[PDB]
Amino acid sequence: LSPAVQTFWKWLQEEGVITAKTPVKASVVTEGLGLVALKDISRNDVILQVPKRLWINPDAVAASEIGRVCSELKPWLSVILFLIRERSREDSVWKHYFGILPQETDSTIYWSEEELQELQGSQLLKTTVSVKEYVKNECLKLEQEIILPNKRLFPDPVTLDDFFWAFGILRSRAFSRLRNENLVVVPMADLINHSAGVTTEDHAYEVKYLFSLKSPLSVKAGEQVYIQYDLNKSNAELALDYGFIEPNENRHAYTLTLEISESDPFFDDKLDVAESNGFAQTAYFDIFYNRTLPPGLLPYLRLVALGGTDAFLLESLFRDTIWGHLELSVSRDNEELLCKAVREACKSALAGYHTTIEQDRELKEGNLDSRLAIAVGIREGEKMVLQQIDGIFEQKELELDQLEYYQERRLKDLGLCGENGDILENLYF
Template structure:
């Protein structure tokens, strides 16, 4: 969806969804699995019934010295699928597991493998994704028991069918999903041409785009990114932990040096419980406090019912055809922005800092263009923090409201229809779609209402000219120009 400032302003503004490319995460990227088909539940005691593959995985961890009879948690079947269940009471900040670095799947593991040399020039996520696919196909892989418990897909929107994606019509999440899928496909084609096909001996098993999407989804949903010197690392066992909105801190993962067996020391991934738990409770963490519901859906395949997670991204752009493009770009860059700026609007929160000044800058033109002169360069952003002129303020209000109206017309349901649908028990993916589109529409209405109120206040606002005259003592408190100066206005 797009909206352009009228040509008379000499400026343009584009509003669209921001693409989420790998791996611009702001915390620990973990997973929320779809439920397994096995009919088993976690008991409230120390005996936890799990599918055979999970039990084999646990035995492997025992053999590797990762877990023992003292380990306070164990994998169990939970409403989300697989999770970590407390075997005994756990206090807040207690260590629940530690995994040695030799079992981590990260760029170092790739570099030390047979494909390390051919992957040396790749982006870290591409190298690790290719490593995951190759290791999964090997019968003798160190991680074979880990791979056996991984899902074939999650509810992330990158795995949705065309029919399922149609429920996201009009949403920014749909645009982000399609853009991300195209990006992954293009990266795979390049990887296939430059690495896989020229090195058939290293990749004897065929690698398909579906294989690559599986690996991409595993990384997107399970990789931690907050450890010291580690921007992308998958940690078996630790990645079974699920997300809860009840957890409001992110300081749960640590890298420490410690014993990794009877006679060895290694770096360990140490995970602490952010909550006090009783035996039988599921252990949770907070994946990322800053992610919107759209990002949660794209990365992990779930959303929170909390409306505060809903966001709508306004993408503003200084048009290259703007006669003042160079000046505006210089001002934007001097204040931490660029030719394009993204502003995430969250439900029931004030407009983000910088949005109104950037809007006023993009719309600046006509008789207001004198503010772009070099003499104002050090002070112009301060002037843009407040209304510049009625024409400028009226223009940004009109364009934003028209953009909201156009965006709202792009959805195939109303808010009321979405709310009615939510009263029924929905398939997990449909529930995500309904929640996302309802949230976006509510935010568009919120944005429209904010700028509608601004329109109603235009006559009462104080603009640059009046503020300047007051500073010079040439304008009274009521706005009247003092003395003979009035004849010039």
């Protein structure tokens, strides 16, 4: 298999970890390293357990020499340091472990400039950039405040590479879905890979303190044991959290960002309306392919587009039903305004890409390298969501007169054809 690995597997033995009731070994799979069943494994069969003595969570960093200096750092920042640190100690309790860890992943945080050019105009590129930058600052602020000061605990220098390394390791390895634990790293069940086969992301791991990894599916001897990293994440999110995406078009998403500008002559009243109904000055709406629009997107759109003619709805009189009206609809002008705004934004966005959906799809038809493959799937996906959105509002523009706006809804209850009320009027005075 692999010397460095052979070592890692031997170490787990001389620790009471890997015993005999452990149906799984390590091997070289298309996705790096994984866990292959040593013999038929059944659904919910405990695969392997790890002693908390071996975690790598804030509780461990706090209980180490640097625990003091990191005493006020954010949970992750603390683990970042811990990791960069232990990776240097020849007497580390994870010497064999780190000697197994991938130096890199296909997460966009490692992509070269050319590799990134393949995501030109994508939302993913934006998101990755932002994240890379943030992590940088936060990490450079760490160097000057903890690494350099305590030159006794941090002997060797520390580059951004080491930082992004630990950050990546953190975001692609740790198990956040756990109660009372959000960033736990477990050297054994670390090698478990992801598969679309697993459709029950309802924790493949439980706490007993120990880490019990139970296989969510029945596996025959020789085959790989997988798990579902996260059903709700988009391909954009999978692409950045780990270095991979799925073919499932339902994983494609594009998030729209709406806000009530302060330059809006009605900012104050509008913001009041939004907040009174669960929305902030700025609001993000995630749009997934083939899903119906998020509730709240249309009403908020109408709020944004409101305008002077209908500003009367922002009056105390309707503060108790305004959202309901926003939910139904305001007026033909309001609707038409917002529809155009969205359609234009979609067209504009669609134009930011350097490839057509056809070209992307022809490429997918050949052999694509890891990162290029990710970029192509991502961009095609986004173009689809973008087009779906424009498609939706194009229909709306057509049905611009089928909707019954505020005024019409008001005159619905007039009772023009009632009784000759004048006969009773004369019986009264």
